[PDB]
Every structure is written in C-alpha cells, then in structure tokens.
Amino acid sequence: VTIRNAQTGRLLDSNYNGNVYTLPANGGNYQRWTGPGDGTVRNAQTGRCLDSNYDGAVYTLPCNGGSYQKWLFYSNGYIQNVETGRVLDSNYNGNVYTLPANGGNYQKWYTG
Ligand SMILES: OC[C@H]1O[C@H](O[C@H]2[C@@H](O)[C@H](O)[C@@H](CO)O[C@@H]2O)[C@@H](O)[C@@H](O)[C@@H]1O
Ligand SMILES: OC[C@H]1O[C@H](O[C@H]2[C@@H](O)[C@H](O)[C@@H](CO)O[C@@H]2O)[C@@H](O)[C@@H](O)[C@@H]1O
Ligand SMILES: OC[C@H]1O[C@H](O[C@H]2[C@@H](O)[C@H](O)[C@@H](CO)O[C@@H]2O)[C@@H](O)[C@@H](O)[C@@H]1O
Ligand SMILES: [K+]
Ligand SMILES: [K+]
Ligand SMILES: [K+]
C-alpha cells in the first residue's frame, strides 16, 4: 500500500515514464506499492521497481534483479538502498532523491 513522508506528509508516487515524486494521498494506484519479498518495491499501478543511483536520483524502471532496486525497511522508518547505502528522501516541494543518512525527518516514512 502507501509510503508517507514523516516530514512533509506527502506520499510516494510514480508514473509510467519512471518518474518518482510525492503528492498528497489521492487514492490512485500510482501511490500504492507492493513488496514481493525479494527486495523490490513495485508500483501498484505500473509494476515498476523504485530504483536510484549514486547521483541521488530516484525513479522507477521495470524490475531487473539489481541491488539498486533492492530496499531495506528499518523499524525507525528509514528506507535504505542496498547498493548505495543512501536513504530515500524527499522535500516539501515533492522532490524524491537519495542522500546520505542524516537523521532528518524528511528521510522517514510511514509504510502500511
Ligand atoms: O488523472 C490521472 C491521475 O491523477 C492522479 O494521479 C496523479 C499522480 O498521483 C499519478 O502519479 C500521476 C501519474 O502520471 O498522475 C497524476 O499527476 C490520481 O487521481 C490518479 O489516481 C489518476 O489516474
Ligand atoms: O550495470 C549497472 C546496473 O544496471 C542495471 O540497473 C539499472 C538501474 O536499475 C540502475 O539504477 C542504474 C544504476 O546506474 O543502472 C541501470 O540503469 C542492473 O542490471 C544492475 O544490476 C547494474 O548494477
Ligand atoms: O537543514 C535542512 C535539513 O537538512 C537535513 O536534511 C537534508 C535532506 O535529508 C532533506 O531532504 C533536504 C530537504 O530540503 O534538506 C537537507 O538536504 C536534515 O538534517 C533535516 O532535518 C533539515 O531540516
Ligand atoms: K503516467
Ligand atoms: K541532521
Ligand atoms: K530543520
């Protein structure tokens, strides 16, 4: 289902172009996500895998088995990219990107 930023209240969102962003909850399936158990976080509408790189950019692409598309969900709300180690982040404008863990609330996420 949904992934909601702890700082901004905006939810994790993505489209068929593979662009990612956050928006207020709006019921659409672009805002729900599925975790099979293989490390991936797949968009409920598109089936694509949330993914990022060493530059900090974050997008979705069809799923390819790479550590890049594998995420770790900690109980403190961090969502960590296995390859880079950088943590999923966003800003009130609805930018999504990754940055070094810095303890910030913009790096926390309620996932249900
Ligand atoms: O009208 C389409 C779409 O609008 C809203 O979706 C937005 C966003 O959440 C989706 O990620 C993108 C996908 O390109 O479209 C909008 O910006 C929701 O109402 C959604 O359910 C709906 O189909
Ligand atoms: O060979 C690099 C990388 O390729 C594939 O991952 C794609 C994408 O998911 C990644 O975010 C970017 C990283 O720059 O790379 C591709 O576009 C996977 O085959 C992956 O295992 C591999 O490391
Ligand atoms: O000092 C602002 C901000 O800095 C640190 O957060 C960084 C990053 O995680 C955020 O997404 C962006 C949002 O604009 O800001 C920094 O780049 C954190 O220490 C944070 O608590 C603080 O508000
Ligand atoms: K779209
Ligand atoms: K900090
Ligand atoms: K602050």
CA-CA distances (angstroms) from residue 98 to 32, 37, 67? 20, 22, 15
Is the CB of residue 10 less than 8 Å from the CB of residue 106?
no
Where exactly are the structural domains of the chain? 1-112
Header resolution in angstroms: 1.6
Instruction: Note the ligand closest to the C-alpha atom of 91.
Output: 3
Is the CB of residue 12 less than 8 Å from the CB of residue 107?
no
Report d(CA 41, CA 47) in Å as an integer. Answer: 9
Binding site membership of 91 for ligand 3 (Cβ less than 6 Å): yes
Is the CB of residue 98 less than 8 Å from the CB of residue 86?
yes
Three-state DSSP class for 108?
coil
Residue 24 token pair = 């207020």
Is the CB of residue 33 less than 8 Å from the CB of residue 64?
no
Decide: residue 37, CB within 10 A, 0-12 exposed, 13-18 middle, 19+ buried.
exposed
Is the CB of residue 49 less than 8 Å from the CB of residue 41?
yes
> Which residue is listed with tokens 């956050």?
22
* Technique used by the depositors: X-ray
- The CATH number that domain 1-112 falls under is 2.80.10.50
Beta strands in 1-112 (DSSP E): 3-5, 11-14, 20-23, 33-34, 42-43, 49-52, 58-61, 71-73, 79-81, 87-90, 96-99, 109-111
Q: Whose CA is nearest to atom 22 of ligand 3?
A: 104
Residue ranges around ligand 1 (CB below 6 Å)? 13, 15, 23, 26-28, 30-31
CA 49 to chain centre: 9
Q: Whose CA is nearest to atom 12 of ligand 3?
A: 91
